[PDB]
């Protein structure tokens, strides 16, 4: 999910380690797959900047790095590094710095 943070609310953004430059201006790309059991977290709420997952009602604070601020999720959504290539089209400026799906035993190392 590519979300456009409002310019007024761009000052409330808190960035993760190694993900400070991931956002392209006011464009933030976060994996849709919920960090808890992997359902898409499609329910984006603007004016609250909360990415809610319908499967188990977990909210991730998009303003801050997409960390879960409610519900079963405990890990933040992986943030895609984005930029613009030649011709101005949006492209990924790399790969996720962490595994993106739901967590599993061989993770966080």
């Amino acid at each position: 999910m590519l979300i456009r943070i409002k310019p007024a609310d761009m000052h409330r953004v808190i960035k993760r380690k190694g993900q400070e430059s991931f956002n392209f201006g006011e464009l933030f790309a976060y994996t849709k797959v919920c960090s808890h059991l992997g359902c898409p977290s499609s329910l984006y709420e603007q004016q609250t900047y909360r990415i809610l997952c319908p499967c188990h009602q977990s909210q991730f604070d998009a303003l801050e790095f997409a960390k879960p601020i409610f519900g079963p999720a405990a890990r933040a959504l992986a943030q895609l590094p984005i930029t613009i290539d030649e011709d101005g089209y949006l492209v990924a400026n790399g790969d996720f710095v962490e595994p993106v799906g739901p967590a599993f035993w061989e993770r966080k190392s």
Partner: protein, 216 residues
């Protein structure tokens, strides 16, 4: 427990740089190629464009000629709706590709868009009859547009990549080539033959357009 890695208040970041993707080494075994042609030279391919500008930098026209199956197919599109007046223009291939506003290769007056190192840019082994150094004409109506083709293949893609970049220079005359034969017409000095300068290349007033054919 909280995940080991979270939160970064310092290091605000930077705007991502413009992405510059690299050609695929894995997916492509080699380098993808575009136009295909014999290209009996260092290599030009079946794609060659050019922009003929004006004395003030305005785009007079945009030509494009490339070899496909041993015969060069070409086409020119008018760059402005009124680049050429309601008349005729003579297009000639000039050996010097510098589409400058005014230059003089020899010691003499520097005509407008006269960077050519002589008349028609004939072949290396041909310097007599009007070889490929002469191109097709450009007739402009009240509409002021250019689109038409001829069959001028004394030079090919191999000959195009010569020692110096060539150009197409369009002056504002018709195509006659001493149409007054010696039987009836006569020269200034009384001789019935034609003029060497006129026979070498299409000679007219100040050049109207000039465009380098070095993939301009």
């Amino acid at each position: 427990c909280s995940p080991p890695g979270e939160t970064a208040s310092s290091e605000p970041g930077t705007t991502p740089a413009i992405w510059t993707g690299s050609p695929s080494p894995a997916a492509p075994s080699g380098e993808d190629h575009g136009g295909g042609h014999g290209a009996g030279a260092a290599g030009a391919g079946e794609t060659l464009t050019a922009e003929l500008k004006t004395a003030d930098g305005t785009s007079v026209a945009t030509a494009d000629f490339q070899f496909a199956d041993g015969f060069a197919t070409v086409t020119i599109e008018t760059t402005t709706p009124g680049r050429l007046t309601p008349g005729f223009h003579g297009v000639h291939i000039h050996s010097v590709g510098k589409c400058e506003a005014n230059s003089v290769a020899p010691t003499g007056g520097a005509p407008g868009d006269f960077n050519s190192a002589g008349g028609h840019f004939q072949v290396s082994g041909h310097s007599g009859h009007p070889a490929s150094g002469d191109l097709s004409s450009l007739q402009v109506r009240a509409d002021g547009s250019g689109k038409l083709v001829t069959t001028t293949d004394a030079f090919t893609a191999e000959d195009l990549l010569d020692g110096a970049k060539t150009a197409i220079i369009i002056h504002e005359k018709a195509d006659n080539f001493a149409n007054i034969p010696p039987e009836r017409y006569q020269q200034v000095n009384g001789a019935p033959g034609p003029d060497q300068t006129t026979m070498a290349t299409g000679d007219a007033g100040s050049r109207v357009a000039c465009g380098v054919i070095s993939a301009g």
